[PDB]
């Protein structure tokens, strides 16, 4: 359930520059990721329910290590791909 | 399917093949692959080569096309089986 | 909140768990991925994402 | 560091038959190895993180074989057991 107008449980789709966080540095790419944050009312049987990110996506990126060395990695859990109630 | 052109300048150490890659997909999401080098003096120098996950900044792009002007090491993404045996630089 | 249980594809037989107690949600934090041998359409071998909880919390 | 015997028998993708597999991963999570079996060598490779903390085989007459073992390049060899 994507969101729009804030109504219920909802994934909220959020863009973010690595430049803003101070780590477009280290990163060669990609240029910032989606934080994506689930804000939502849900019901309550379940005792009490949240809503809460229920599946993660992997993010690829291409950065550099410590030692000044070019890495290339699939980011684990690193999207909020879906929002849940909890 | 989606396989692409593998590249690994560091392949030694890593212990890699120096150089095609085929796209691990998970469950139907979008498949893209990219491309890294050096234009250093006036000659370019690979670095990687390879599948790249979902990039909302890749669909679409039939040509590796690196866009971002005066990088370090220039990177372009793009979609299409092998899209990134070819690359260019086009600063907007 | 609090860690908490397993149960019993090639292998492994069984994986592992819960996040509970109260928050003034708690729920899971840190995930696990575990390796799975199992038949494909009459085998392969994925090192498998998340399929346990390894660390709770709140929201 | 954690390195292991690799083998693969259906290698129609970019895999290799055999040759080690380097094992990287979780920090301070524990790494394992397997194997996986006229004898025929399924597979071979490493295992993320208890069946595993040599390789021997515990489950009784199955019918696709497999070990599980800590300890670098310990899926090399492998053997028969009962339970």
Redo the contacts between chains.
């Keep these: 359930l994507e969101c729009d107008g804030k109504v219920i449980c909802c994934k909220k789709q959020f863009?973010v520059s690595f430049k803003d966080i101070g780590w477009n540095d280290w990163i060669?790419?990609?240029?910032g990721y989606?934080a994506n944050y689930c804000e939502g009312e849900c019901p309550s049987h379940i005792l009490?329910?949240?809503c809460?990110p229920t599946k993660?996506?992997?993010?690829?990126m291409?950065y550099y290590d410590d030692g000044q060395?070019?890495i290339?990695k699939?980011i684990?859990?690193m999207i909020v791909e879906e929002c849940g109630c909890? | 399917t989606r396989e692409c052109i593998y590249y690994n300048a560091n392949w030694e150490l890593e212990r890699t093949n120096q150089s095609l890659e085929r796209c691990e997909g998970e469950q139907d999401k979008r498949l893209h692959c990219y491309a890294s080098w050096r234009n250093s003096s006036g000659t370019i120098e690979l670095v990687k080569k390879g599948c790249w996950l979902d990039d909302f900044n890749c669909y679409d792009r039939q040509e590796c096309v690196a866009t971002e002007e005066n990088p370090q090491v220039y990177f372009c993404c793009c979609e299409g089986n092998f899209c990134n045996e070819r690359f260019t630089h086009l600063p907007e």
């Design positions: 863009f060669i790419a990609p240029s989606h009490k329910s949240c809460v993660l996506r992997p993010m690829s291409l060395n070019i290339k699939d684990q859990n909890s």
